[PDB]
Amino acid sequence: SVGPVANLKIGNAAVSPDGYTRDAVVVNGATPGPLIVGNKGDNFRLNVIDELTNHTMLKSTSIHWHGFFQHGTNWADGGAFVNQCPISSGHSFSYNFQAKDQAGTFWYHSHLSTQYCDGLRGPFVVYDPKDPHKKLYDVDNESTVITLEDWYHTAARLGPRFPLGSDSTLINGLGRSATTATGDLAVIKVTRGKRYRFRLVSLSCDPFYTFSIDGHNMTIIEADAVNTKPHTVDSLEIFAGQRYSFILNANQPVDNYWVRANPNFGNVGFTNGINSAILRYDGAAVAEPATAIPPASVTPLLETDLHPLVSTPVPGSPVAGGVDKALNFVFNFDGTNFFINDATFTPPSVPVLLQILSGAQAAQDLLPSGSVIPLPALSTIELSFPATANAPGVPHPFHLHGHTFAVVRSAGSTAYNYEDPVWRDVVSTGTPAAGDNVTIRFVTDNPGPWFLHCHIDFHLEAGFAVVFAEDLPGTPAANPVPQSWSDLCPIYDALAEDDQ
Ligand X SMILES: *[C@@H]1O[C@H](CO)[C@@H](O[C@@H]2O[C@H](CO)[C@@H](O[C@@H]3O[C@H](CO[C@H]4O[C@H](CO)[C@@H](O)[C@H](O[C@H]5O[C@H](CO)[C@@H](O)[C@H](O)[C@@H]5O)[C@@H]4O)[C@@H](O)[C@H](O[C@H]4O[C@H](CO)[C@@H](O)[C@H](O)[C@@H]4O)[C@@H]3O)[C@H](O)[C@H]2NC(C)=O)[C@H](O)[C@H]1NC(C)=O
Ligand Y SMILES: *[C@@H]1O[C@H](CO)[C@@H](O[C@@H]2O[C@H](CO)[C@@H](O[C@@H]3O[C@H](CO[C@H]4O[C@H](CO[C@H]5O[C@H](CO)[C@@H](O)[C@H](O)[C@@H]5O)[C@@H](O)[C@H](O[C@H]5O[C@H](CO)[C@@H](O)[C@H](O)[C@@H]5O)[C@@H]4O)[C@@H](O)[C@H](O[C@H]4O[C@H](CO)[C@@H](O)[C@H](O)[C@@H]4O)[C@@H]3O)[C@H](O)[C@H]2NC(C)=O)[C@H](O)[C@H]1NC(C)=O
Ligand Z SMILES: *[C@@H]1O[C@H](CO)[C@@H](O[C@@H]2O[C@H](CO)[C@@H](O[C@@H]3O[C@H](CO[C@H]4O[C@H](CO[C@H]5O[C@H](CO)[C@@H](O)[C@H](O)[C@@H]5O)[C@@H](O)[C@H](O[C@H]5O[C@H](CO)[C@@H](O)[C@H](O)[C@@H]5O)[C@@H]4O)[C@@H](O)[C@H](O)[C@@H]3O)[C@H](O)[C@H]2NC(C)=O)[C@H](O)[C@H]1NC(C)=O
Ligand U SMILES: *[C@@H]1O[C@H](CO)[C@@H](O)[C@H](O)[C@H]1NC(C)=O
CA 434 – CA 431 distance, rounded (Å): 6
Interaction residues for ligand Z, span 128-167 (CB under 6 A): 153-155, 158
CB of residue 402 to ligand U, shortest distance in Å: 37
Interaction residues for ligand Y, span 301-330 (CB under 6 A): 320-321, 323, 325-328
Q: Which is nearer to ligand Z, 328 or 361 (CB)?
A: 328
CA 229 – CA 422 distance, rounded (Å): 10
Q: Which is nearer to a second copy, 291 or 317 (CB)?
A: 291
* DSSP structure string for 438-480: EEEEEE--S-EEEEEEES-HHHHHTT-EEEEEETTTTHHHH--
Q: Does 272 bind ligand Z (CB under 6 A)?
A: yes
Sign (positive or negative) of CA dihedral 313, 314, 319, 321: positive
Tell me the per-residue interface mask from 227 to 256 with ligand U, x by CB under 6 A, - otherwise: -------x----------------------
CB atoms within 10 A of CB 369: 12
Tell me the per-residue interface mask from 277 to 316 with ligand Z, x by CB under 6 A, - otherwise: ----------------------------------------
> What is the residue type of 268?
V
Active-site residue, 399 included: yes
Determine if the peptide bond prior to 376 is cis (ω within 30°). no
CB of residue 388 to ligand Y, shortest distance in Å: 7
- Using DSSP's 3-state secondary structure scheme, residue 353 falls into helix
Candidates 146-154, 193-201, 305-313, 390-398 — which segment interacts with Cu ion by CB under 5 A? 390-398
Please pick, among 211, 338, 453, 458, the residue that the annotation labels catalytic.
453
Interaction residues for ligand U, span 290-319 (CB under 6 A): 298-299
Please pick, among 36, 63, 106, 109, the residue that the annotation labels catalytic.
109
Sign (positive or negative) of CA dihedral 163, 166, 167, 171: positive
CA-atom Rg of the chain in angstroms:
22
Q: Is 435 exposed, middle or buried (0-12, 13-18, 19+ CB in 10 A)?
A: exposed
Tell me the per-residue interface mask from 395 to 424 with Cu ion, x by CB under 5 A, - otherwise: -x----x-----------------------
Q: Is 335 exposed, middle or buried (0-12, 13-18, 19+ CB in 10 A)?
A: exposed
Active-site residue, 396 included: yes
> What is the residue type of 418?
Y
CA 301 – CA 173 distance, rounded (Å): 25
DSSP label at residue 354: H
Contact 108, 97 (CB under 8 A): no
Rounded (5°) CA angle 218-219-225: 110
Q: Which is nearer to ligand X, 54 or 217 (CB)?
A: 54
Which phi and psi (to 5°) does residue 252 adopt? Answer: -85, 170
CA 392 – CA 390 distance, rounded (Å): 6
Active-site residue, 455 included: yes
> What is the residue type of 259?
V
Residue 217 interacts with, from ligand Y, a second copy, ligand U, none (CB under 5-8 Å by kind): ligand U
Please pick, among 399, 405, 451, 468, the residue that the annotation labels catalytic.
399
* Residues contributing to the site for a second copy (CB under 8 A): 160, 162-165, 178-179, 264-271, 290-300, 333, 335, 387-389, 391-394, 431-433
CB of residue 161 to Cu ion, shortest distance in Å: 13
Residue 470 bridge partners (DSSP): 375, 448
Among 28, 180, 217, 312, interactor with ligand U by CB under 6 A: 217
Active-site residue, 239 included: no
Q: Which is nearer to a second copy, 292 or 496 (CB)?
A: 292
CB of residue 64 to ligand Z, shortest distance in Å: 22
Please pick, among 10, 36, 44, 64, the residue that the annotation labels catalytic.
64
398 to 90, 142, 232, 389, 401: CA distances (angstroms): 34, 28, 25, 16, 10
Active-site residue, 117 included: no
Binding site for ligand Z (CB under 6 A): 20, 22-23, 54, 56-57, 153-155, 158, 180-181, 272, 320-321, 323, 325-328, 384, 386, 437
Q: Which residues bind ligand U (CB under 6 A)?
A: 216-217, 234, 298-299
> Annotated active-site positions, please?
64, 66, 109, 111, 396, 399, 401, 453-456, 459, 464
